[PDB]
Design a protein around this ligand. Structure first.
Ligand SMILES: OC[C@H]1O[C@H](OC[C@H]2O[C@H](O[C@]3(CO)O[C@H](CO)[C@@H](O)[C@@H]3O)[C@H](O)[C@@H](O)[C@@H]2O)[C@H](O)[C@@H](O)[C@H]1O
Length: 385
C-alpha cells in the first residue's frame, strides 16, 4: 500500500524547511512516505552508495559535478528530458548541465559566492563597498585601523574559501573559461610564480593575509563558528556562498546584512561563481519511479518553491516565484545570476576539488607563494596527463 522513498540531502542549512515541505507532500500523498537523509561527508557517502548500488530514490547532487557527468553516462540517473515539469524551469537552466544532450538533473536554485558585510558597522565606520582589488586591500586595513576584525575565516573548513580562490583566478583572467585555460587546459608545469596572472592570484589571496585581518583562534574555527562570529558582530565580513545567509539569519543578528561580489583589478570587472544549489536527480534503478517523480514535481510547484525561497534566498529558476528586490541582503552577491558575470564552478572540468581547498587554505595559514604554486601544479598535472 504505502511505499517509502528516500531523499539524500546535502543542503544541511535547509533541513528544517525541506522536512516541512516533505510533510506537506506526505499530507497530500498519504500512500507515499519520504525519508530525508542527512549524513556528514555526504559527498563521500554518495560515492559509496552509488558504487554499492544502494542509490537513494531522489538525490541532491550538484549538476556541474563530474560525479553527475560520469554517473549520468553510466545510467545511474533517470532521463528527465520528456517530463512536463521540466518546462517550469526558466532561463534554460535545466539544459545548462546536460549530459549527452540529455537532462538528468533539475536545478531549482542557483547558488552564488561573495562577501557578507555588516551594513550597520560599515556605516558606523564610514566604509564603502570596494570596487577594485586595491580598494578591497584598503577596506581591510581601515577596519584594522578602527580596531575591528575584517574577516571571519573558517580554518578547519577549507571548502569555505573555494569560491574565493576560484574568483581570484576569474577576475585575473577575465572569466571561467579563461581561468580553466590557465590552470586546467594549460601545459604541465605551466603555472609559474613569475606569471602576472599568478601574481594577481596571490595579490587577491593576500587580502585575507593582511595584518590582523582574521579573528582570534581562526586556524581551528569551523563553518558554524564563523556564522556565529559574524552574527554577533565579532567580524565585519566573511567570504562564503549564498547558502550561508539562512544560517546567519537563524542566529538573529542585531544588524542589517549586506553582500558584495569580489571585485576585479578595475571597476566593473567583479564576478561571482556557483551552480545548481537545490538540484535533484532521480535514481534509474528506483523501485518506486512514479512516487519519486511526484516528489520532484512537487518541488517544481511555485507555491511549494515559494516556501523554500522565502527561507533560503538563492535565486530560483522555477517559474511563478516572487523573488526579493534589490533591497535583499543577498542582492549584491546574486544580482548577476543567470548572466555573463556568473560563471560555473571551475571543478566542472576537474577530477576533484578537495586538494584545491587545501592549497587555498594552506596559503592563508602559511603564505608560501612557491609552495602554493607547487600544490597547484601537483593538483592539475594528473588531469593534464
Ligand atoms: O564551494 C564549495 C562547494 O560549492 C558547491 O556546493 C554547494 C554546497 O556547499 C556546502 O555543502 C557542503 C559543506 O557544508 O559541501 C559539500 C558539497 O561540496 C556537501 O557535502 C556539504 O553539504 C553548503 O553547506 C551547501 O549549502 C551548498 O549547497 C559545489 O557544488 C561544490 O562542488 C563545492 O565547490
Amino acid at each position: 500500500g504505502t511505499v517509502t522513498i528516500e531523499y539524500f540531502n546535502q543542503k544541511k542549512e535547509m533541513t528544517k524547511t525541506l522536512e516541512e515541505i516533505t510533510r506537506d507532500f506526505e499530507k497530500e500523498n498519504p500512500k507515499i512516505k519520504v525519508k530525508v537523509v542527512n549524513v556528514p561527508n555526504a559527498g563521500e557517502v554518495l560515492k559509496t552508495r552509488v558504487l554499492a548500488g544502494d542509490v537513494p530514490d531522489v538525490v541532491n547532487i550538484y549538476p556541474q559535478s563530474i560525479e553527475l557527468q560520469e554517473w549520468a553516462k553510466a545510467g545511474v540517473f533517470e532521463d528527465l528530458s520528456n517530463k512536463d515539469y521540466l518546462k517550469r524551469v526558466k532561463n534554460g537552466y535545466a539544459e545548462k548541465y546536460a549530459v549527452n544532450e540529455k537532462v538528468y538533473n533539475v536545478p531549482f536554485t542557483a547558488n552564488a559566492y561573495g562577501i557578507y558585510y555588516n551594513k550597520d558597522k560599515f556605516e558606523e565606520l564610514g566604509l564603502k563597498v570596494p570596487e577594485t582589488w586595491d580598494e578591497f586591500e584598503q577596506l581591510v586595513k581601515d577596519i584594522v585601523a578602527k580596531g575591528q576584525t575584517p574577516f571571519g575565516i573558517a580554518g578547519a573548513d577549507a571548502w569555505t574559501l573555494n569560491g574565493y580562490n576560484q574568483l581570484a583566478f576569474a577576475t585575473a583572467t577575465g572569466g571561467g573559461k579563461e581561468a580553466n585555460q590557465y590552470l586546467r587546459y594549460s601545459q604541465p608545469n605551466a603555472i609559474k610564480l613569475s606569471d602576472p596572472i599568478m601574481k594577481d592570484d596571490i595579490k587577491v589571496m593576500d587580502i585575507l593575509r593582511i595584518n590582523g585581518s582574521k579573528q582570534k583562534n581562526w586556524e581551528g574555527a569551523g563553518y558554524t563558528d564563523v556564522i556565529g562570529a559574524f552574527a554577533r558582530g565579532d567580524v565585519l565580513m566573511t567570504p562564503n556562498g549564498s547558502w550561508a545567509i539562512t544560517a546567519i539569519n537563524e542566529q538573529k543578528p542585531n544588524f542589517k546584512i549586506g553582500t558584495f561580489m569580489i571585485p576585479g583589478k578595475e571597476k566593473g570587472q567583479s564576478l561571482t561563481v556557483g551552480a545548481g544549489d537545490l538540484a535533484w536527480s532521480i535514481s534509474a534503478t528506483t523501485k518506486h519511479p512514479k512516487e519519486a517523480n511526484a516528489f520532484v514535481e512537487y518541488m517544481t510547484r511555485p507555491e511549494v518553491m515559494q516556501k523554500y525561497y522565502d527561507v533560503d534566498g538563492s535565486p530560483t529558476a522555477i517559474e511563478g516565484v516572487k523573488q526579493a528586490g534589490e533591497d535583499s541582503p543577498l542582492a549584491g552577491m546574486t544580482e548577476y545570476a543567470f548572466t555573463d558575470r556568473h560563471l560555473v564552478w571551475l571543478q566542472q572540468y576537474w577530477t576533484s576539488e578537495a586538494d584545491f581547498h587545501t592549497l587555498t587554505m594552506n596559503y592563508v595559514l602559511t603564505g608560501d607563494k612557491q609552495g602554493m604554486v607547487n600544490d597547484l601544479n601537483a593538483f592539475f598535472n594528473p588531469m593534464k596527463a
